[PDB]
Structure 1
């Protein structure tokens, strides 16, 4: 890396690790459309295995970007519409609530109070349906934003319906492969197990446990290299050869709703650039990010705005990730750690480094 970049990263990251007590970390800066990688520490402390560019990490919520992108591609293919009511795809979903809730609502957390999480007692397809049928909304559709896995997960389960594929095959075929994310998995195969880092929560080594709609809402595992490649793709959609994906990417970055100074895409979250750092930093905090907030509709939605600060945080019980990019400046960063540390800290660091370029 050019010394500038080096200095920046090191200057900012080291202290973060030290303070947060992060066992491993990989970072990639995308500068002028070129990535530069940094790794630190361990992937597995016990076996003293270090973090490399091949180490796999749990994306947690950053999976939502993928979901949102696979959904846009489906839209671009003419297989679904955001305006379609949910029932068109899950006709058994017969209860009165479901009435006017469309794919758009689900995909954006504005359905009217769907829970953050799917209850752990929900296992079968039967449990699921019940869960849905019996859910009672707190608000009218399209009035209040509630960050929810059961909201977005559901959208992604249904988006792939017309295709005929399972969520995983569709992601693979339609997203991973075309983009050349060969080390990106929902289910990590045996041949890759050796590179899969241990999450660490309370000194204990942990892995994401399976659950309803996990693939769809938080099930991706990937590497710093593939992450960087994913960031490059979202930064320059137009260079993507596959029409639908290209288009699909752009739709995921479209602005459907606004709250405070933030806009809701399809998995992505964006702000206007330049941005008020206090805004994003503090906004990232759980108390704020997970709360119920009133939304204003953008009618019609605004197409992907080059001047933005695009991003998404993500976490599992043993990991914590962050991605941010500014299409207009051809810059981004990706931060992967095998420890779930505080959001604002991630935000602060990303902004420091990115502000410096």
Structure 2
């Protein structure tokens, strides 16, 4: 009955949302009572008929930021950087720029002062262009005052964390972070040998969309991973103590809230909500206006442990993919919803919520 109920629950949560959002393929992984549960739906590729499996690689887009945050957490807990470091401390190119007055924390938590959602399309995946972009960037408002969800913000945070560790971000992820997290199906650059696992992404008119190179793509949205691996990462988050101490600490560093915007407490990468909270509030927290509009932050007097009765989540999308990860530290409950369509965050949260609610009920 338990496996049946869980399947019934996940199917009931997933299938209508897949149909409603014409999601070709969707992988759910749920960590429940110390066990992974995988539910795979539809097609990794509509064209070659490859089914989604728990090993299908999906672009997780901005969910990558939680990996980025973990690397940063590593840098932080390795004392290679501090959250209150000015950004320019970790990149000479930024000295003299406004990043002299912007903390790593600001970058991490999108409060640098209006760094946009994405790099402008003019900024290519080019060290110099990224350098030039930040050098010329000016805060729209005081750093530390407004959250404007931003790839270049946390991208730079990750980039600087990498710099603080003296290695390229991508190399640190591949050589240290992913192996530390026991992730062998998690890639910034999917190996050729794993490309068969790489789901097709689908956008408008089902145009195939796999994420192309972009500035700080690795940091912002670089990860392709399987539901199984992303759940392993969720499990690492649920149980940092299961990782070697440096990485346990790194993960812990992503479970610290720095401010609140509405119901959301912003950690490094992870965004936390009190749990339970209504689906609508969780959706609002993961809504377009939340992402696209600056929100005055309510800074916490001290970093808040993002644990216990909290839902930590991250939405992530690429043009062709829509990922959502949510976990409830205090419930040893985690779920991953990876889809090869960028379907509305609200819908991802709806699936997650239906699953979480059904697990409660």
Residue correspondence of structure 1 range 48-197 to structure 2 within 5 A: 48-95=49-96, 97-123=98-124, 124-197=126-199
Cα distance between partner residues in 1 of 2:222 and 2:177: 15
Cα distance between partner residues in 2 of 1:289 and 1:342: 12
Cα distance between partner residues in 2 of 1:90 and 1:31: 42
Q: Which residue pairs with 1:214 in the alignment?
A: 217
Cα distance between partner residues in 2 of 1:263 and 1:102: 18
Q: Does structure 1 residue 204 correspond to structure 2 residue 207?
A: yes
Residue deviations 1:60-91 (CA, integer Å, cap 9, x gap): 11000000011011111111111111121122
Residue deviations 1:124-162 (CA, integer Å, cap 9, x gap): 332222221211211011100000111010111111113
Cα 1:338/1:96, change in 2 over 3 Å: closer
Is the Cα contact below 8 Å between 2:263 and 2:285 reproduced in 1? no
Cα 1:22/1:137, change in 2 over 3 Å: same
Cα distance between partner residues in 2 of 1:289 and 1:161: 27
The answer to which of 322-331 and 83-92 deviates more is 83-92
Q: Which residue pairs with 1:304 in the alignment?
A: 306
Q: Does structure 1 residue 233 correspond to structure 2 residue 210?
A: no
Q: Name the SS for the 2:164 alignment partner.
A: coil
Is the Cα contact below 8 Å between 2:28 and 2:54 reproduced in 1? no
Q: Which residue pairs with 1:318 in the alignment?
A: 320
Residue deviations 1:231-274 (CA, integer Å, cap 9, x gap): 1110111222x111101111111011111121000000001122
Is the Cα contact below 8 Å between 2:26 and 2:41 reproduced in 1? yes
1:22 deviates by 1.0
Q: Name the SS for the 2:202 alignment partner.
A: strand
Q: Which residue pairs with 2:40 in the alignment?
A: 39
1:96 deviates by 5.4
Cα distance between partner residues in 1 of 2:20 and 2:164: 48
Is the Cα contact below 8 Å between 2:272 and 2:306 reproduced in 1? no
1:36 deviates by 0.9
Q: Which residue pairs with 2:288 in the alignment?
A: 286
Cα distance between partner residues in 2 of 1:263 and 1:341: 24
1:349 deviates by 1.7
Is the Cα contact below 8 Å between 1:71 and 1:248 reproduced in 2? yes
Cα distance between partner residues in 1 of 2:267 and 2:189: 26
Is the Cα contact below 8 Å between 2:58 and 2:321 reproduced in 1? yes
5+ residue gaps in structure 1? none
Is the Cα contact below 8 Å between 1:61 and 1:217 reproduced in 2? yes
The answer to which of 285-294 and 58-67 deviates more is 285-294
Q: Which residue pairs with 1:29 in the alignment?
A: 30
1:31 deviates by 1.0
Residue deviations 1:90-144 (CA, integer Å, cap 9, x gap): 2232435333211111111001111111122223332222221211211011100
- The match for 2:266 among 264, 267, 285 is 264
Is the Cα contact below 8 Å between 1:174 and 1:245 reproduced in 2? no
Cα distance between partner residues in 1 of 2:287 and 2:165: 37
TM-score (ref. length: structure 2): 0.95
Q: Name the SS for the 1:37 alignment partner.
A: strand
5+ residue gaps in structure 2? none
1:52 deviates by 1.7
Is the Cα contact below 8 Å between 1:227 and 1:334 reproduced in 2? yes
